[PDB]
Amino acid sequence: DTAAAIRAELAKMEPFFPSGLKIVYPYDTTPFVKISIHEVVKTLVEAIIL
Amino acid sequence: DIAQVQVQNKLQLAMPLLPQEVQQQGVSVEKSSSSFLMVVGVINTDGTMTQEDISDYVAANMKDAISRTSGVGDVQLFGSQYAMRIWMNPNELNKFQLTPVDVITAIKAQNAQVAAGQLGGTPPVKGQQLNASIIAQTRLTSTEEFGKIL
Amino acid sequence: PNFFIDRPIFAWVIAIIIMLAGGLAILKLPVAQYPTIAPPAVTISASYPGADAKTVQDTVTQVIEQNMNGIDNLMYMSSNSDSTGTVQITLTFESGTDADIAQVQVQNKLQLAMPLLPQEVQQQGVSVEKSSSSFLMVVGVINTDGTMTQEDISDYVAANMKDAISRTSGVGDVQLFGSQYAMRIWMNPNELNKFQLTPVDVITAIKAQNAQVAAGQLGGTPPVKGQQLNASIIAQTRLTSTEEFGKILLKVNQDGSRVLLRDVAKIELGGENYDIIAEFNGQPASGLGIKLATGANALDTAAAIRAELAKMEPFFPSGLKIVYPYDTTPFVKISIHEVVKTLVEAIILVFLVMYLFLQNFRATLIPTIAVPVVLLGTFAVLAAFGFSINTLTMFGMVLAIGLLVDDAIVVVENVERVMAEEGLPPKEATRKSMGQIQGALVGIAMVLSAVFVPMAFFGGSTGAIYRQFSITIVSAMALSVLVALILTPALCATMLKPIAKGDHGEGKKGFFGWFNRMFEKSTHHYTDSVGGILRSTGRYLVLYLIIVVGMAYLFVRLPSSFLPDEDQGVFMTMVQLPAGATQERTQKVLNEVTHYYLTKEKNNVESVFAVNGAGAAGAGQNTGIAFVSLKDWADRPGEENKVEAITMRATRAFSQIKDAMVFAFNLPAIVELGTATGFDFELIDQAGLGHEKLTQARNQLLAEAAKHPDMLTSVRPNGLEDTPQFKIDIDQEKAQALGVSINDINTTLGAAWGGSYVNDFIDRGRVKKVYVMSEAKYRMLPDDIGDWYVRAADGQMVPFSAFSSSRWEYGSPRLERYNGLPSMEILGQAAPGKSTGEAMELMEQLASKLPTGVGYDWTGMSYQERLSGNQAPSLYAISLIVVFLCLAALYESWSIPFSVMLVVPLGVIGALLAATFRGLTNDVYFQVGLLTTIGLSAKNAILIVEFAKDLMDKEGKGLIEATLDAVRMRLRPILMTSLAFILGVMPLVISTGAGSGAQNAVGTGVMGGMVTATVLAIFFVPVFFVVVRRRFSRKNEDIEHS
Amino acid sequence: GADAKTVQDTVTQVIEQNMNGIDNLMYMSSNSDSTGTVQITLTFESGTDA
Amino acid sequence: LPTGVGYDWTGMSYQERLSGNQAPSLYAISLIVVFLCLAALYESWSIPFS
Ligand SMILES: CCCCCCCCCCCCO[C@@H]1O[C@H](CO)[C@@H](O[C@H]2O[C@H](CO)[C@@H](O)[C@@H](O)[C@H]2O)[C@H](O)[C@H]1O
């Protein structure tokens, strides 16, 4: 949630950035929690199929 | 929240016993994680700017708002904000028989905001008919005026 | 359930228990006008004496905006930087945040920013406060003999009254309106110059001869052996008289003469600040703003306060009387009076219908006993969930009466019917019938809470308002069904008199009952007709479809509101003069208005409170406000004696026949909220741009919305436009040359024109301030600059005309910020037929038209709502799904739930009809009303279809016959209730006097809905059941006899 | 160094004046010292959140 | 004592003043709780009086 809010703020700042200003994302504990818990959900449903 | 309250309430009792340099450079009390949740990157692709230009765009356009994001404990700057940098020459200073202290005092004097007053100020005189703001000594703005500092 | 029919004492005991806890809750329960509705806001306020807008924006404001981070649950941060030297930072938080925690976090981050502040600001005190704008009452304090000036009075407040009122029980906050006494030293520049002295020396003097000093002690520790005395050293003491301040030395002259302060400057006890000058019916006054304690009872806080003032009455100085310019309390006294009045009347009407319909006295005593119990209990259930007796919760009960009343009636009736039909003894009739309506009763509770709880989960201020009604009503309802299953059956089975089989009393009596045949005949007429319509149904299906499309049309073409505006015994008129105007001019206007209300409204206006210096627009000499109090409502009978009409003739009065802008208006009801069809735009300077560029973008947008009057309407900025300001360019070179310290130039200039808080002194036992400033006559006009001289290094005086060049420029008097950044506020509302949303979309489109570095944003009201409207469809989809699921349980049908759900429009067409022909608007009271109405139609249809199904299944009767019999036996109760309801509500629909806006809002929609819904349902429901029932199954069939 | 009567109507009663609308306050008592310390105790309704 | 000299209890004596002023109320309710209860379990309306 904290992270989703921050992505909202950065997005609200995007159009007023100087010429050439891109944001990069070198490190975030977020994508692992997301894809990991999603694989566990994949598994429950798969398991119901079996 | 409460722990933070009890802690900062002891910190303010310690504050007067602190240095003025320490005091005004700012002390912070935070309920934070010891690990970064995330690291946000800022670059320029078309490389029309050095790291400082960037460091300042970050510190001057983004970092205040990100640290006001609800739920964000600490934000660390990989870089720094812009500052008025006065880099003294020991030789060219000694030549004129002046010391760093005089640089300090000078800047303190020719650069400031000043409580002025008001034309038609309150409490006025009978029938009086003009009210306006006195604009006095204002902070310096550009770099060059720091050269015209006498 | 059946259980109590054989245990009437146990029932009585639970009843008593509910009554006692409820009565206990009634005794120790809070009262307020409204609950907490607005999101939490905490403001940091600070003042920088003499400084200008840009100064306070650039010495404090930005320093604080930068130091306020990592504070929990922040929504938005908005601030004013005033050229009156005050800076205010609003931090508005997410709704439901711990108010107190937020305020604590804000004030501790500020306590960290404090060392980075100016020394003057730091020492004047920065304050952190919670921001409800809702004072319980505003007490005026005056003098009759023109004995004392307003500074005198203000001080009298601060030194004699303010403390005891804050000792009054139930008073959680006392705010002071005015300024305290100060030691005011008004320098004379001429007699200052005569003696070659500058304000600087005045400063240094006053700081020096007036001070407390760390002394010490005789017999101090560790003393010497045998030592014999311990006592206190009393040293240099602060001054006490004004006179002692006259005797302070500024210089010794060579010829032995001394130069005292008394000489260069007039010295007197006078106001800490003179911006705001207040007059009460012309006579001078000061004021006290009392806020209700947290969770406290309003009526007793007010009563206690008036009593406290009376206990102080004989101790007031000559001519000092206390007045009450603003008081929420009688609005609440009278509204409470009206709600209970309605409840008892309603009870009376249910007795009157119950007699003039069942005419058996002990029958009529049953529902009479029922509801009191239920009310009481709901008060306890509410108390348990931490509410108070306030407007919203009470009109929630007023709405609940319908459901309570119906439930009681349903039971008593059905029992009576079972007797007059079958010849059962009272009790056996009771088990037959409780056992007849039971499932319908639990189901109706499930469906009623199924529509009423989803609206509890609305978010934001809108969500709070809904939450009140939702809980009050569901609790009243759930208790009414428990009571309908435990006590009512007990009361039925026990105290009810037995009826002869096939009685109907179809005559027997001469005086009172010549009606029973008339009703009997007609109830058969009715069912005759119903079968008749069940013959050809199609035509009637058409009628329905028509009714619905029409209902939609009525729904769309009806106006949305938030709440009905209320004459509250009080209104106000605001006054705005041309930029840079004078205290004395604004004051002149305000005296004129004051008189207008005291003239052309000799009979309506009780008292007028003119405040010069503080307004709507902001602070400054340039603005005024008028607080206008109105006579008690009994003395204002007519249509012309009401606030709408008054504010009309006053705005009409001060528009055409004035030289400056004067609006007159009435406050909203929940006094901190928004203008239903309006919005609050924030135009934000996003790039490293300029104030000049931002304002130009603002003009640009004002123009582009000027081009769209079919969508947006009267779109306007909410700030102060630029004023001409006086620039003093100091030549650093010349001043350093002629031998003058720039500091001496600055601080003499300051202490001359802006003033300086120097030291503190102790009057009568209370520490106050010491201000040194020019005299009036030497600091008004720009030329006066010349009268002030700066002493040089050597010992010589220097005119400002020697090193200071001067001019005029433009500048801004009010510098606004949004989220740390430079911003500009833009208020507005939508076109007459157009929706606030459309107007907002167009506004985003226009603001998108702006130059680069210009972003846009929403704040306040527009924030809370842009979140909240996303939810009505979702919550109501939840509701349909849940209710259908419930009815799907109750029968054992996935389809029969449609024969009752199909009934919902029947009631709406009455509400929408009734609002439009009455000229009302689609607001809360109307919406809660619509739901309430849906609630009765759903109840009745659920009972009808239950009965129908029951004869079909557990009696093997046919279809058309079964529904026939059904609607037959359940005609009478329907009609009984609806008679009761329409009669109790009717007062709400036809009422003026206090609070009648809300009362009409409830009453109308409801009444219209009741009428069309029952007088439609008795015909449309049977077709619903029948037509639906005929989409199942394989023959099977249509039917009968097994 | 200040005296009792000094610290009491400069510090004690000044601070005692804002102690209204405090939830669950039972009683408030305060001391004023010429040894230089000034102290105000707030005793609260039993079961109040400390 | 002379007019304007009032009196009070605090701390131990306060709390004691409390238990004293609460004893009758306690006996009213607790007696009444039981009357209500026996009238319930024992369907008799009379068993409570005796
Ligand atoms: C609570 C107060 C109620 C106030 C209502 C005021 C009056 C208006 C509503 C009454 C509507 C009923 O009007 C009803 O029409 C149907 C058929 O369409 C009639 O039925 C009649 O026509 C159909 C065919 O055309 C046949 O079945 C025929 O045998 C005959 O009964 C009913 O005999 C009549 O009673």
Short mmCIF file of C-alpha atoms in Angstrom, two decimals, chain C residues 20-171:
data_model
loop_
_atom_site.label_atom_id
_atom_site.label_comp_id
_atom_site.label_asym_id
_atom_site.label_seq_id
_atom_site.Cartn_x
_atom_site.Cartn_y
_atom_site.Cartn_z
CA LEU C 20 -34.17 0.02 31.97
CA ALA C 21 -30.91 -0.15 30.04
CA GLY C 22 -32.46 2.14 27.42
CA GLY C 23 -33.74 4.62 29.99
CA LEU C 24 -30.31 4.39 31.59
CA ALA C 25 -28.79 5.24 28.22
CA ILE C 26 -31.31 8.06 27.74
CA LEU C 27 -30.18 9.60 31.05
CA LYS C 28 -26.46 9.56 30.45
CA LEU C 29 -26.29 10.27 26.72
CA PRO C 30 -24.54 13.12 24.86
CA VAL C 31 -26.43 15.59 22.71
CA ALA C 32 -25.05 17.61 19.82
CA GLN C 33 -26.44 19.27 16.72
CA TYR C 34 -24.57 16.97 14.41
CA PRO C 35 -21.96 14.21 14.93
CA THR C 36 -18.35 14.53 13.93
CA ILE C 37 -18.54 14.61 10.14
CA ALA C 38 -15.60 16.50 8.64
CA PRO C 39 -12.08 14.92 8.27
CA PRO C 40 -9.53 15.91 10.90
CA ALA C 41 -7.67 19.14 10.38
CA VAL C 42 -4.94 20.60 12.47
CA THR C 43 -3.58 24.06 11.85
CA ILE C 44 -0.16 25.45 12.62
CA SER C 45 -0.55 29.20 13.05
CA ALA C 46 2.31 31.75 13.50
CA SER C 47 2.76 35.54 13.28
CA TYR C 48 5.76 37.62 12.21
CA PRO C 49 5.12 41.26 13.34
CA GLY C 50 5.28 43.82 10.52
CA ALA C 51 6.58 41.33 7.94
CA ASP C 52 4.96 41.03 4.46
CA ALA C 53 3.41 38.07 2.61
CA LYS C 54 6.65 37.12 0.87
CA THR C 55 8.55 37.42 4.18
CA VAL C 56 6.36 35.00 6.13
CA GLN C 57 6.24 32.68 3.07
CA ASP C 58 10.06 32.71 2.98
CA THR C 59 11.13 32.63 6.61
CA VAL C 60 8.57 30.39 8.31
CA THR C 61 6.02 28.98 5.87
CA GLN C 62 8.45 27.19 3.59
CA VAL C 63 10.66 26.16 6.50
CA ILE C 64 7.65 24.46 8.20
CA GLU C 65 6.23 22.95 4.96
CA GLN C 66 9.66 21.39 4.59
CA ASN C 67 9.83 20.05 8.17
CA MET C 68 6.30 18.42 8.30
CA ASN C 69 7.05 14.93 6.99
CA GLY C 70 6.49 11.37 8.22
CA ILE C 71 3.27 12.27 10.00
CA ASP C 72 0.69 9.45 9.90
CA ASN C 73 -2.28 9.43 7.50
CA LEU C 74 -1.92 12.79 5.80
CA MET C 75 -4.49 13.68 3.13
CA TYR C 76 -3.61 17.20 2.01
CA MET C 77 -1.63 20.21 3.23
CA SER C 78 -2.89 23.76 2.41
CA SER C 79 -1.64 27.17 3.67
CA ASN C 80 -2.10 30.98 3.74
CA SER C 81 0.79 33.44 4.03
CA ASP C 82 -0.77 36.80 4.99
CA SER C 83 0.77 40.23 4.64
CA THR C 84 -0.88 41.00 7.94
CA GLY C 85 2.04 38.84 9.05
CA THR C 86 0.13 35.74 10.03
CA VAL C 87 0.79 32.37 8.42
CA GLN C 88 -1.60 29.44 8.70
CA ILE C 89 -0.91 25.86 7.70
CA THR C 90 -3.88 23.52 7.40
CA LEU C 91 -3.10 19.82 7.59
CA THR C 92 -6.23 17.84 6.73
CA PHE C 93 -6.06 14.16 7.58
CA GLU C 94 -7.75 10.90 6.41
CA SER C 95 -11.15 10.50 8.01
CA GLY C 96 -11.09 8.29 11.10
CA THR C 97 -7.49 9.12 12.04
CA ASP C 98 -6.89 9.61 15.75
CA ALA C 99 -7.44 13.30 15.96
CA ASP C 100 -5.26 13.62 19.04
CA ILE C 101 -2.40 11.53 17.57
CA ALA C 102 -2.38 13.64 14.47
CA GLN C 103 -2.20 16.86 16.48
CA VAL C 104 0.56 15.46 18.62
CA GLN C 105 2.67 14.39 15.55
CA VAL C 106 2.20 17.72 13.83
CA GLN C 107 3.23 19.69 16.97
CA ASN C 108 6.34 17.53 17.55
CA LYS C 109 7.60 17.98 13.96
CA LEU C 110 6.98 21.70 14.30
CA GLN C 111 8.95 21.57 17.61
CA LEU C 112 11.80 20.22 15.50
CA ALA C 113 11.46 22.99 12.92
CA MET C 114 11.37 25.76 15.59
CA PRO C 115 15.20 26.35 15.71
CA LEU C 116 15.18 26.99 11.94
CA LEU C 117 12.66 29.81 12.44
CA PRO C 118 13.19 33.56 12.78
CA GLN C 119 13.82 34.74 16.39
CA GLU C 120 10.83 37.05 16.41
CA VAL C 121 8.46 34.33 15.20
CA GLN C 122 9.91 31.79 17.57
CA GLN C 123 9.32 34.06 20.49
CA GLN C 124 5.82 35.15 19.51
CA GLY C 125 4.79 31.53 19.75
CA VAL C 126 3.76 29.15 17.05
CA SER C 127 0.48 27.38 17.78
CA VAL C 128 -0.93 23.95 16.89
CA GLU C 129 -4.72 23.53 17.15
CA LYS C 130 -7.52 21.18 16.01
CA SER C 131 -9.86 22.69 13.50
CA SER C 132 -13.52 22.23 13.90
CA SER C 133 -15.00 25.67 12.91
CA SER C 134 -17.95 24.80 15.17
CA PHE C 135 -18.10 26.85 18.34
CA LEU C 136 -21.05 25.84 20.56
CA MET C 137 -21.67 29.47 21.34
CA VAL C 138 -20.17 32.92 20.93
CA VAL C 139 -20.52 35.17 23.96
CA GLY C 140 -20.35 38.88 23.50
CA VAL C 141 -18.94 41.13 26.22
CA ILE C 142 -19.83 44.83 26.24
CA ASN C 143 -20.07 48.15 28.04
CA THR C 144 -23.19 50.37 28.14
CA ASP C 145 -21.95 53.80 29.48
CA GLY C 146 -19.18 53.86 26.86
CA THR C 147 -17.12 53.48 30.00
CA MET C 148 -14.39 51.38 28.52
CA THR C 149 -12.86 50.90 25.04
CA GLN C 150 -12.70 47.49 23.44
CA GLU C 151 -9.09 46.93 24.43
CA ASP C 152 -10.16 47.53 28.03
CA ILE C 153 -13.03 45.07 27.70
CA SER C 154 -10.92 42.44 25.96
CA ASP C 155 -8.53 42.60 28.82
CA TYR C 156 -11.43 42.40 31.27
CA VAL C 157 -12.40 39.14 29.58
CA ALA C 158 -8.87 37.80 29.74
CA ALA C 159 -8.46 38.76 33.38
CA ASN C 160 -11.90 38.12 34.91
CA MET C 161 -14.21 35.72 33.03
CA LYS C 162 -12.46 33.48 30.52
CA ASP C 163 -11.11 31.35 33.41
CA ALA C 164 -14.44 30.57 35.11
CA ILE C 165 -16.20 29.72 31.85
CA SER C 166 -13.37 27.31 31.16
CA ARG C 167 -14.23 26.07 34.70
CA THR C 168 -17.82 25.53 33.59
CA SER C 169 -18.53 21.85 33.30
CA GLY C 170 -18.87 20.68 29.72
CA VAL C 171 -16.79 23.46 28.22
#
